[PDB]
């Protein structure tokens, strides 16, 4: 009498071990020495949006962070050491050259962001505390498309929130410095597993000659 | 350039998976009910979906530096607490597995940093300080053990600390007591290509009321 | 005045106890080996030695506001951690009982204070914030319950939170796993003159290593 | 098959309930309404020194704090909220009129204070961290009685440390204010359960006319 | 002056004001009647205190057009309420109260401040009360120039540093949250300029900033 | 870009109308500057000192900031201002420092309306204009009951007197005054009425006795 | 002066110094030769700036005896590195560097500062630039006196407050850790004094501080 | 108590030798004070101004502090100093403010030896004497190579000039100087050589033109 879950784990790793790990001694021979991913990714915890899947990332390719609604809070050593550490490690230690915040269709996190009043009353332990990061995004979307159906509405808010997060990335000095030296780039993505579509946008950043006389 | 890597890669998944399983994703798109919640490190070399061959819809994944789970704190650790509260009380997962791994950069730091009042990072030390109880233990039970050994002990014991922290969340304890939730610790050694798993038992029983 | 209260009182104990048990204290004076470690509130109305009729040498007692046990933190909670580490690893106690009690001033505060960023005390709120997970739970499961009820739920659930915090100490977990240590929560209701006790089960078991 | 410990607890409370609680309905009838102890006591956790015993304190008499080596750390909201809260509650909420720090013979805490090097190397998780509060006391005693036998030595250090703690009480504004308004008094005690003796000293504090011309 | 002394400076000031009054103020009653009520400059300019580079003249700015900050080496330090409040107050007032739409930082040829930045060792010893303390804001630009053009002749170093310093200031404008919100909201644009009065030229550049989709496959 | 264009246009106009038509002048200015004036003036877009006093290139070393304020000597907090005074006074060796205030100054308006009671509602503005608190205190003590508009005019002028006082906290400023190589003046430009007032400051030190 | 003007103030200063030089300095070569090398005053004194209460005269203090602080109402504010650094620097220098053994705070009769403390409302409105701000240090003493002697006549209020203020300052000396360590180590003693120049009297009191056994039964 | 005794003795001596022997004088002083001087002097036990300048009761309103420093006007940080100047100048209406520095001043020695490089090793001393940084900067620039003892003398005198400059940041001080109802002077007492130097400060404002 075994644990279904435990077994499910065992059989999964076994599959990985023989089909992947073993059939690629070259790869894991190096990966065992260190990592050097060019990407750092923020994706939702949501079971349906594994980043390694949707974008077919191979091992050693992307340093990943997954949290409720793929939110990137602003720089704060007392309230957001978790996020700050991942960003600081990825950008300054692994030297990623890209940061991508990926939002997705039907996000329960975003949906709660829209549904919660944020009028000083909380019905959750941490959820509201955490989704508040996207309030700006919610204000914008709600003010702009105030009469848009919730279904549509959420879609707008899922996308805006990525920009908000992107906006928050700029509160980190080492992120800004990365953009200045052009050793870093920031991008936003949107996965709609319903229509099975993907949208990718980015941040234009750099100086440009205007004229000389 | 990298924007292409991103298109091609998504195109691959589009045809090779999203399509080749219309009845699959056609269902996923309708909602989610994963039985697992996984805590794994952000290291690009240990994507849980790769290491445990998870399929979309199976696990709600939280990935952070050194796969740490801080104790209950609404002021300092909302990120974590939010995921736990969501997976447990909303998605209704049945398991929470904290997976540590060999050659963890996060744990390596925890080991080198002195935590004597001086900090040389903006966030890194603040974060991995969560694992200090594990560092304290290992250094007291395996102080004269080779560094490589120390790291493994700390990585595994760090998982244990995180399992203990999971027990500071009322709704995690409640789910354990109702046997609707199970806690597990894992350890992936991508060097020797091995994997360990262990279970945690937590229960409460009334003794008497005079 | 009060200096007298102190002399007379000590004189009483001198003859009425210290002497009337020469073979008793003659032994105590040689060392201590208490089987219990008790966490009870500083309230003058609940001295554990009175409520559970403990005799000198039976229990290593830690008394603080609202009998709270914060999680492992060498920077903010050395007082607690030191007592636990001493009782567990040095005196070798077998049990750790956290005793909450009715009409707890400490818990009452925890309930009234908003913990919304504003503080009106120097230490009081900082301290009882430890019990927030308990406040969160009770307010979500018994929000429309009469205040008196709420307090009792919070007092008992605060004990549970503290039991969970005890599990963030590696050496407490280790002792539990070796079955050399047991965790218990108690609740003294000096109003109706009743007492509850409950036990906590914690264990770890290996599952597999491929 | 019952738990010895559990049973020991049950029988203890039962004894209390019938012999004490019941045979004093007057007392607990009031005590159930609130408390108002005139004392606040700092005693060692040590099983052999229950304050309620040694000084025969009755319920409602003393607000107690027990910790390793009955140490009173100085005012610090980040490192010592535990101590600060007890002192703040006792002094400002219960209005105690006395604070007594009681040291005792053969204190493992003090003994460790003396035995530990405190040279930047720690062999404990919290013990050394916590007993350091008494370093001043240790310096004094050690410098003064450097050649005193450890047995004797410890005794000196157990007593000095109380003064150190007493010294730390003065770092709390509300304690100082209490002494200024004379609504509070500070005392030190030493219990020697070996010879079964008790020493009580206090803090002289107040203004006194010197002369008028 | 028949024995009575005269202050050249006071007289110069009086002559100048009367000239402005006659040739400009009095000849533009519409303009000045409107400016008397408020200002809505579309530009905020940072230029050097140097007496040869008055933005008014060089870019022909008219009264009401440019909210101007002038200091040694036209430097923009990073956000610091304790050390750089004058700079921060100017940007905060311009961006949030006057709602300017452009912030232009202009460096120039033969800048004495940039020359000091390059001439000073910044080796732990100072020989000025404030000059070194201030131009240290440009150390990062000095480093870049020293690395990229380490063998170049001093004068060439200066020109390079004068321009790179402008870039370092633009970088520092990004440490101001209200500036970032402006770029994000597309209500603000940042620009760098360079005035060579030796040759008689002006170079202008800008900061590209903004989201732009790459694909929706 | 409408803005880059405005900038493009402006320079070309300067180039042919001023620059190319004064080769002798720009030829000497290319070699260095020796302006007789250092001028502090508000950043306000309506009070450019070049225009108001018709200063020509090479005549005035200019500092412009919010409310034309001069903080007292402080290498830790007011390096920007100190660095300009030091450069002007010791290196370019200006002979005059003129602090010019003006009608309807927003900085002074803020100074007069902010409470300065512990709470701040700005990130830097209040912090900066606090420099003017002594002028606010004087005005309120002597004209406290006056309508706000008058209080603004009084405060704008006293704030210049406060800055002149702060210049005297720079040792090299005191020394130039003592040596008669430097002069200090305050100015007030009213762009509503279209007027200008100038006043001078006298400062000296004299040995009395040594016994 | 035959037409040449003379400064009374400068002359008063010169006359006074020459007098001190002749009658004191020159007549105490031993004393002054020793003071020229260092000072070791056993007292630190706080007295009012009031021109009528110079501690030198009133307590006949000789040069080298008392490190003195004089300010409005002889007030000792509590420890504050940001608001009260002058007071803190004097106590720190006296206690830790000069190692004085006594700190004496002396109040006095008809103190203008204490009169203002009592006359001012402290109702949210100020009418002074600094006077109210400073004497607010004595608000606690004003409260005590107003409570204990609320019906007394104004003058009586002042005398009470002048003395109580001294006590509030003694209380504030206790907010200084180095002062507390001194009392504890018995290397420092605190005293309050009161000088009535109307009647011609002096009252002195001290702070009792120290551990003292009660029993060893 | 040896100390209370010393204090007891001293007063009685004052009582019969000065107080009782000058009934006319103390009788008027009991009615109020109108000292023509306000004096800032060091707290140092060797430089009591009453002794050094032989000031009699009723002649000088005195402020004594570490290094006889006068910070600039700041109601938030330097209320103690500001309150004394305001009382002396506006209420007692003193006619002179004299700032007196002295040989071998410990405060100046600290000023010259502390680094003021971000780290402090005192709780208040460095904080307070930083007021003198401009004098330290001047001295180092003009006498930087001098032996420490000379640097101390130079800095002690320039520190008085710095305080005189800070007095000019009090509006009511500028106004008394302008109105000729107040005079400012610096002094230096050398108790090693036994000498005294006095110097005066001249300050004024004059209307130049209004057009
Ligand atoms: Cl976070
Ligand atoms: Cl977190
Ligand atoms: Cl604690
Ligand atoms: Cl504590
Ligand atoms: Cl600045
Ligand atoms: Cl500045
Ligand atoms: Cl002060
Ligand atoms: Cl002050
Ligand atoms: Cu993944
Ligand atoms: Cu007890
Ligand atoms: Cu201009
Ligand atoms: Cu004196
Ligand atoms: Zn989602
Ligand atoms: Zn890792
Ligand atoms: Zn309680
Ligand atoms: Zn003990
Ligand atoms: Zn320049
Ligand atoms: Zn203005
Ligand atoms: Zn007085
Ligand atoms: Zn001195």
Q: Which of the ligands is closest to the CA of residue G169?
A: 7
- In a mutational test of the C interface, the residue from G211, G214, G216 whose CB has the highest number of chain C CBs within 10 Å is G214
Beta-ladder partners of H202: F204
**F89 token code pair:** 């006074």
Dihedrals phi, psi of F207, to nearest 5 degrees: -70, 130
On whether the CB atoms of residues D189 and D198 are closer than 8 A, the answer is yes
Residue H54, chain F, CB below 8 Å: the answer is no
> Does the beta-carbon distance from A73 to B54 stay under 8 Å?
no
- In a mutational test of the F interface, the residue from G10, G21, G25, G129 whose CB has the highest number of chain F CBs within 10 Å is G129
> Which residues are near ligand 8, the ion (C-beta closer than 5 Å)?
G 86; H 78, 80-81
> Does the beta-carbon distance from F211 to G14 stay under 8 Å?
yes
> Does the beta-carbon distance from C207 to B200 stay under 8 Å?
no
The rounded distance, in Å, linking the Cα atoms of H206 and H95 is: 21
**A146 token code pair:** 């105030």
DSSP G120: -
- In a mutational test of the B interface, the residue from D76, D124, D125, D132 whose CB has the highest number of chain B CBs within 10 Å is D125
On whether the CB atoms of residues H4 and D213 are closer than 8 A, the answer is no
On whether the CB atoms of residues E107 and E131 are closer than 8 A, the answer is no
In 3D, which of F193, F190, F128, F131 has the Cα closest to residue F161? F131
> Does the beta-carbon distance from F208 to G129 stay under 8 Å?
no
In 3D, which of H106, H99, H117 has the Cα closest to residue H157? H99
DSSP H196: E
Contacts of H114 (CB under 8 A, 6+ apart): H120, H121, H122, H125, H126, H129
Residue A125, chain C, CB below 8 Å: the answer is yes
**F159 token code pair:** 């704030």
> Does the beta-carbon distance from B133 to C206 stay under 8 Å?
no
In 3D, which of D100, D123, D103 has the Cα closest to residue D112? D123
Q: Reduced to 3 states, what is the DSSP secondary structure of residue D97?
A: coil
Contacting partners of chain E (3+ CB pairs under 8 A): A, B, F, H
In 3D, which of C70, C66, C26, C49 has the Cα closest to residue C163? C70
In 3D, which of G70, G54, G74, G10 has the Cα closest to residue H29? G54
Rounded to the nearest angstrom, the distance between the alpha carbon of C210 and the centre of ligand 14 is 20
From the list E10, E18, E129, the residue facing H137 with the nearest CB is E129
**E87 token code pair:** 């700079």
- Which ranges of F48-207 would DSSP assign to H, the alpha helix? 49-52, 79-86, 106-113, 125-129, 133-143, 148-167, 171-178
- Which ranges of F42-119 would DSSP assign to H, the alpha helix? 49-52, 79-86, 106-113
Q: Reduced to 3 states, what is the DSSP secondary structure of residue F189?
A: strand
Dihedrals phi, psi of F138, to nearest 5 degrees: -65, -50
Classify residue C117 as left (phi > 0), alpha (psi -120 to 50) or beta: left
**B105 token code pair:** 């950069």
Q: Which of the ligands is closest to the CA of residue E86?
A: 5
- Closest residue on chain D to H12 (Cα): D213
**H28 token code pair:** 């008027």
> Does the beta-carbon distance from B45 to A60 stay under 8 Å?
yes
On whether the CB atoms of residues B107 and B193 are closer than 8 A, the answer is no
The rounded distance, in Å, linking the Cα atoms of E56 and F52 is: 11
A-B contacts at Cβ under 8 angstroms: 237
Rounded to the nearest angstrom, the distance between the alpha carbon of D55 and the centre of ligand 10 is 10
Rounded to the nearest angstrom, the distance between the alpha carbon of C199 and the centre of ligand 10 is 23
> Which residues are near ligand 13, the ion (C-beta closer than 5 Å)?
A 44, 46, 107, 109
Q: Specify the length of chain C in residues.
A: 210
Q: In whole angstroms, how far apart are CA F11 and each of A124, A207, E164, F7, F61? A: 60, 21, 21, 6, 21
> Does the beta-carbon distance from H138 to F171 stay under 8 Å?
yes
Q: Specify the length of chain D in residues.
A: 213
Q: Reduced to 3 states, what is the DSSP secondary structure of residue H61?
A: strand
Dihedrals phi, psi of G205, to nearest 5 degrees: -145, 170
- Closest residue on chain F to G130 (Cα): F137
Beta-ladder partners of E48: E71
Beta-ladder partners of D131: none
Q: Reduced to 3 states, what is the DSSP secondary structure of residue E121?
A: coil
DSSP H146: S
- In a mutational test of the F interface, the residue from E78, E81, E89 whose CB has the highest number of chain F CBs within 10 Å is E89
| Residue E188, H or E segment | none
Rounded to the nearest angstrom, the distance between the alpha carbon of A50 and the centre of ligand 9 is 4
C-alpha torsion E28→E30→E36→E41, nearest 10: -90
Rounded to the nearest angstrom, the distance between the alpha carbon of D168 and the centre of ligand 4 is 12
Residue E10, chain H, CB below 8 Å: the answer is yes
Q: Which of the ligands is closest to the CA of residue F46?
A: 18
On whether the CB atoms of residues C50 and D52 are closer than 8 A, the answer is yes
Produce one character per residue of D126-152: b if its CB has 16 or more CB atoms within 10 Å, e if not.
bbbbbbbbbebbbebbeeeeeeeeeee
> Which residues are near ligand 12, the ion (C-beta closer than 5 Å)?
G 54, 56; H 48, 50
On whether the CB atoms of residues H86 and G80 are closer than 8 A, the answer is no
Residue H45, chain F, CB below 8 Å: the answer is no
* End-to-end alpha carbon distance in chain E: 86
Q: How close does chain D come to C209, measured CA to CA in Å?
A: 31
Quick one: chain A helix, strand, coil %, rounded to 5? 50, 20, 30
Residue E217, chain B, CB below 8 Å: the answer is yes
Q: How close does chain H come to D172, measured CA to CA in Å?
A: 19
Beta-ladder partners of G191: G104, G206
Q: Where are the beta strands (DSSP E) in chain C?
A: 36-41, 59-64, 95-101, 182-189, 194-209
Query: In the block, which residue shows the tokens 């000091």?
Result: E116
On whether the CB atoms of residues B80 and A80 are closer than 8 A, the answer is no
DSSP E101: S
The answer to whether the Cα torsion of D7, D12, D15, D18 is positive or negative is: negative
**F189 token code pair:** 């430009």
The rounded distance, in Å, linking the Cα atoms of G92 and G101 is: 13
On whether the CB atoms of residues G106 and G203 are closer than 8 A, the answer is no
Q: Which of the ligands is closest to the CA of residue B31?
A: 13
On whether the CB atoms of residues F197 and H210 are closer than 8 A, the answer is yes
Rounded to the nearest angstrom, the distance between the alpha carbon of C48 and the centre of ligand 10 is 6
C-alpha torsion G182→G188→G190→G191, nearest 10: 180
Residue B136, chain D, CB below 8 Å: the answer is yes
**G198 token code pair:** 């109307």
Residue C171, chain D, CB below 8 Å: the answer is yes
**B186 token code pair:** 């894992």
Domains and CATH numbers, chain C: 1-210 (3.40.1050.10)
In 3D, which of D59, D55, D58, D28 has the Cα closest to residue D42? D55
The rounded distance, in Å, linking the Cα atoms of E31 and F51 is: 14
The rounded distance, in Å, linking the Cα atoms of F167 and E133 is: 19
Residues of G in contact with F211 (CB under 8 A): 14, 17-18, 21
DSSP A50: -
The rounded distance, in Å, linking the Cα atoms of C165 and E60 is: 70
Residue B122, chain A, CB below 8 Å: the answer is yes
Burial class (CB in 10 A: 0-12, 13-18, 19+), C21: middle
Dihedrals phi, psi of E188, to nearest 5 degrees: -145, 145
Q: How close does chain A come to E122, measured CA to CA in Å?
A: 23
Residue D197, chain G, CB below 8 Å: the answer is yes
What's the Rg (C-alpha) of chain E? 20
Q: How close does chain E come to F200, measured CA to CA in Å?
A: 9
Q: Reduced to 3 states, what is the DSSP secondary structure of residue H194?
A: coil
> Does the beta-carbon distance from E42 to F3 stay under 8 Å?
yes
B-C contacts at Cβ under 8 angstroms: 107
> Does the beta-carbon distance from E215 to B11 stay under 8 Å?
no
What is the distance, to the nearest Å, from the Cα of residue A204 to the centroid of all Cα atoms in its chain? 19
> Does the beta-carbon distance from H208 to F185 stay under 8 Å?
yes
DSSP D89: H
**F190 token code pair:** 């009213």
In 3D, which of H200, H32, B167 has the Cα closest to residue C165? B167
- Quickly list DSSP for A94-152: S--SEEEEEEESS-HHHHHHHH---SS--SSSSHHHHHGGGHHHHHHHHHHTTTS-HHH
On whether the CB atoms of residues C48 and C61 are closer than 8 A, the answer is yes
Q: How close does chain F come to H136, measured CA to CA in Å?
A: 10
What's the Rg (C-alpha) of chain C? 19
Residues of H in contact with G13 (CB under 8 A): 53, 98, 185, 187, 196, 198
The answer to whether the Cα torsion of B105, B110, B113, B117 is positive or negative is: positive
The rounded distance, in Å, linking the Cα atoms of F91 and F106 is: 33
The rounded distance, in Å, linking the Cα atoms of G97 and G101 is: 12
Rounded to the nearest angstrom, the distance between the alpha carbon of D105 and the centre of ligand 16 is 7
Residue A208, chain C, CB below 8 Å: the answer is no
Which resolution in angstroms does this entry have? 1.9
Contacts of B124 (CB under 8 A, 6+ apart): A85, A88, A89, B65, B109
**Are there at least 3 beta-carbon pairs closer than 8 Å between H and G?**
yes
From the list G10, G18, G129, the residue facing F208 with the nearest CB is G10
């Amino acid at each position: 009498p075994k644990s279904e879950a435990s077994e499910r784990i065992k059989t999964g790793f076994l599959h990985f071990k023989k089909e992947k790990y073993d059939k690629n001694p070259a790869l894991y021979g190096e990966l065992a020495k260190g990592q050097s991913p060019p990407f750092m990714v923020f994706a939702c915890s949501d079971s349906r949006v594994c980043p390694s899947h949707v974008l077919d990332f191979q091992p050693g390719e992307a340093f990943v962070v997954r949290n409720v609604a793929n939110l990137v809070p602003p720089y704060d050593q007392a309230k957001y050491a978790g996020t700050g550490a991942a960003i600081e490690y990825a950008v300054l230690h692994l030297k990623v050259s890209n940061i991508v915040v990926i939002g997705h269709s039907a996000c329960g996190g975003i949906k709660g962001l829209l549904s919660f009043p944020f009028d000083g009353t909380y019905s959750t332990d941490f959820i509201e505390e955490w989704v508040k990061i996207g309030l700006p995004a919610k204000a914008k979307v709600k003010a702009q498309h105030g009469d848009a159906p919730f279904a549509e509405l959420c879609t707008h808010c899922e996308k805006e929130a990525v920009n908000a997060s992107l906006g928050n990335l700029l509160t980190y000095p080492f992120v800004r410095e990365g953009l200045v030296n052009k050793t870093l780039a920031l991008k936003g993505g949107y996965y709609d597993f319903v229509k099975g579509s993907f949208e990718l946008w980015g941040l234009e950043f750099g100086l440009s000659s205007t004229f000389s006389v």
